[PDB]
Design a protein around this ligand. Structure first.
Ligand code: RET
Ligand code: BR
Ligand code: BR
Ligand code: K
Length: 216
């Protein structure tokens, strides 16, 4: 069983999410700034949730826990960004709403019994994602630019990383088993794991290493 590629990617994901969680916990100890503490809580929770979900897929070894993890973590990552640019509550609610639709229709597309329809759900989900990225890239950038240089600079990096990583999910899904079935399952699992770790641990490393989280 341990020789199967599928199991290996799940095991590596579990290890990387767990290590990232522990490292963020270590980095956060000592920090007393009220503002920085909020970022540490959110950013530490994200890989912790993914670790539990990745561990679950290992114990179950199934990918239902995948969408469950995305359902919880994507809105948290959005909160992280919203907090950095001090976004309005109305805009935050719209983002979370679109995010729920994105993950939700994504699951419906994975569960659909008939072909052709797989892409209908993928299209609706991708539209939801495009709205989110449009808000992050054009909307949030304006607010960040009117903020402290450290904040404007860090937001732009996180934004660029988020846009690229999130955009890769619909591509992988389409070429994977839920879509056209071009790429084998083990490769698709590898791709999603790499994206998950990069979007959570990588994203968190960039954010938490920055002075932009402090109130100052
Ligand atoms: C930690 C995990 C993250 C940041 C996951 C992000 C996932 C997405 C942006 C997923 C998007 C999808 C679509 C746009 C359409 C097809 C189905 C999904 C759910 C794979
Ligand atoms: Br995840
Ligand atoms: Br806003
Ligand atoms: K401090």
């Amino acid at each position: 069983i341990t020789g199967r590629p599928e199991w290996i990617w799940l095991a590596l994901g579990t290890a990387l999410m767990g290590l990232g969680t522990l490292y963020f916990l270590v980095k956060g100890m000592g920090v007393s700034d009220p503002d920085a503490k909020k970022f540490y809580a959110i950013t530490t929770l994200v890989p912790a949730i993914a670790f539990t979900m990745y561990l679950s897929m290992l114990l179950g070894y199934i990918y239902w826990a995948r969408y469950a993890s995305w359902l919880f973590t994507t809105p948290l990552l959005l909160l992280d960004l919203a907090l950095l640019v001090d976004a309005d509550q109305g805009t935050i609610l719209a983002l979370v709403g679109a995010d729920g639709i994105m993950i939700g229709t994504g699951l419906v597309g994975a569960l659909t019994k008939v072909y052709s329809y797989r892409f209908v759900w993928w299209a609706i989900s991708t539209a939801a994602m495009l709205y989110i990225l449009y808000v992050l890239f054009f909307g949030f950038t304006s607010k960040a630019e009117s903020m402290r240089p450290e904040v404007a600079s860090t937001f732009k990096v996180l934004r660029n990383v988020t846009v690229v990583l999130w955009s890769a999910y619909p591509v992988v899904w389409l070429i994977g088993s839920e879509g056209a079935g071009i790429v084998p399952l083990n490769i698709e699992t590898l791709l999603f794991m790499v994206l998950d770790v990069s979007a959570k641990v990588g994203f968190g490393l960039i954010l938490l290493r920055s002075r932009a989280i402090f109130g100052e």
